[PDB]
Each structure stands twice: as C-alpha cells, then as structure tokens.
Amino acid sequence: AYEYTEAEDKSIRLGLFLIISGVVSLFIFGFCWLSPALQDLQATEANCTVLSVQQIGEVFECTFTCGADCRGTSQYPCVQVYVNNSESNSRALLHSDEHQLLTNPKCSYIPPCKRENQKNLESVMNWQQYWKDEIGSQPFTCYFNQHQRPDDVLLHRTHDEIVLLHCFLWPLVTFVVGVLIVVLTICAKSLAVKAEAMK
Template identity: 75%
Template sequence: MAKIRVSYEYSEAEDKSIRLGLFLIVCGVVSLFILGFCWLNPTLQNMQCKSANCTVISVQQNGEMFECPFSCGADCRGTSLYPCLQIYVNNSESNSKALLHYNEQQLVMNPKCSYIPPCERDNQKNSEKVLMLQGYWTEEISSQSFTCFFNRHRRPDDVLLMNSHDDNVLLHCVLWPLVTLLVGALIVVLTICTKSLAVRAEAIQKRKYS
C-alpha cells in the first residue's frame, strides 16, 4: 500500500509540473502575440525615423490654449490650460519647414503644439513653464543646429526632438515572452524525462528481484 501511495503522489506532482509548464508556454505565446500588436509594430514603424540636422526658423505662441489633466491627490483631479508653443525648424534632409515636437507621445496628444508642460492646477504656472521654454529656444538654441528625427512617410511636416522608441523596447518585447515560453517548455521536458527515468529504474528494479 505504501508503494502505491508514493507512486500516486509522485504522479500527481508530475501532473502539476506539466500543467505549470503548459501554462507558462501559453502565457509566453499570448504575450508575444499581444506585445507584437501593442509594442512591436509601433516600434518597428518608429525605428524607420531618420536622424537629421534641424535649425530653428521661428519660436512663437499661436494664441490658443489647450486643456491638460492634473492630479493633486486621490480626490483632487481636474483640467487646466496651457498656451500652445510652436517651434518651427528647417529639416536638413528634406530642406522643408516642419513643426518640432518633444517626442511621439506629445505629437499624438497634441499635434498642433511643440510642447506639453507637466500639468499644474494653476494655469499661470503652466504658462510660465511654456514661456521659460520659449525663452530657452529663442536665446540658446536659435543659432545652433541640433539632431532631430523624422519619418518622411508617416508625418513629413513634423519632426521629433527625442526618438522615444529604441532597440531596448524591441528587445523587451521579444525577450521576456520568449523566456517564459522556454522556461515552460523546459519544465515540461524535464518532467517527462524524470518520469521516463523513473519508469526505467522501476523496470530495472523489478528485473533484479524477479
């Protein structure tokens, strides 16, 4: 009876290991599928951005005000206003006028403006941040060329100051799901090999005592 009980417990442990391995394999495959649509495709598109030299043409506020959401605590949320700063630059690659944006996220959030400040509850503070940046670009950068990024096919009239997606994002999109998938496969293979060795050892032991 003791031998039967040990064998049953061992078989149950094997089943749990196999189920865990299969669960990890499924998680890895699903993660690859989801990240492929959510991160990999946008990253590959963004990696088509080319670097260029940009020079400032004009720095101005166009008079429009836009809303931004702020949070000052668990029950303190709302929207405030910030002025629209537009920094127009000359793109050396296409030799054309383009609107500069800090990164692609800000471009998507507000394609009309070059900068979205960290949102404060006080509209005046938002205006001061934008005015400070306007002065910096007017006085410090206006006579200098700097590296910018553009995508001729997606947004030929816009350039980015920061290329937010890079090879690291692509690496993480693929690496961690693959690690999960490989660990799951390794657990399943090791469990099957252990079971096979146990069966052989039991058969050899039976031959000895038969």
C-alpha cells in the same frame, strides 16, 4: 507500474501550458509591443536647424490636479517652433514626443499644468527663451518620418530600443522554462523505470 503518476501528469500539463503561454504572449506582443515600436523605428534620426519661434495667442486648456482629485482646468499659451530639416529641408514643426503632438498638434510644448495661469505662462516663457537663445547654431539630433507625418519633427522617440529586447525575452524565458519542465519530468520517469527494471 511503468506509467506517469498524477503529479507527473500535472507537471507535464504545466510545462505544456507554459509553452502555449509563451507562444501566445509572443503572438500578443507582436501586435501590441512590436508593431508601434517598429513604426517608431521607421522614423529616421536626422539633423535639424531651428528656423524660427512664433506665438499665436490662441490659448489652450490644461488640467491641474490637487491631492483629493481636483479637476481644475487652467489655461496656457501656445508657442510654435518651426525648424529646418536636414532630410526634406522644409518648414517642419518641433514637438517633444508623440504624446504632446497628439494632445495638441498646434503647439511645440505643453507645460505641466499648474493652478495659476501666470505660472503656466512663465513655464512657456522660460522654454521659449531657451529656444530663442540657440538659433541657427547646433543642429539637433532629432527624428522625422516623412511617410506618415512629414510636417512635424520630434525630439525624443517614444519607445526605447530595449523594448525590442523585452518583447522577445520573456516569452522566450517562458518557453524555455516550460520545455525544461516537460524534459525533466520525462527524464525522471524514464530513469525511474530503468531503476526499477534493473533488479
């Protein structure tokens, strides 16, 4: 009997499944992980000097939450912080991330929503006072993408560089383990064939 058993056939099927799973997960992560991360790295790490700090008076709505699923909607004032870029050197806005920019593009900082509107206003005033002290000096290591959003300047990138590592790592680990299973099963079968035919 020089043929695979049921366990070796199932093990080859498992190794082939892990090869397919590694390729498919890499194919999935190319559109989910990689492409917005490459759009993030398309934004250039640049310098920026703060131009001015303004308030508008038009308040917006946050959402504070208690323990047992409260949906209290307190309100918070708005501060616009305009900067002077190093690349374009135009009137650009400041933002903490794409998250703050997409929930409210017309402000530069959104506080953690609390119950009291006085506490939200105090969080605004503390952050505004810090950005009112350091004016003109110490140009910031900020980020900018003139091809997509040329009017807004971020403070932190959304995705780390290690995202590019983990997007390519675990599909490759899945591929290697699947290849090792097929190789070890075939090698064990061929050595057992030679060990039985050696007599």
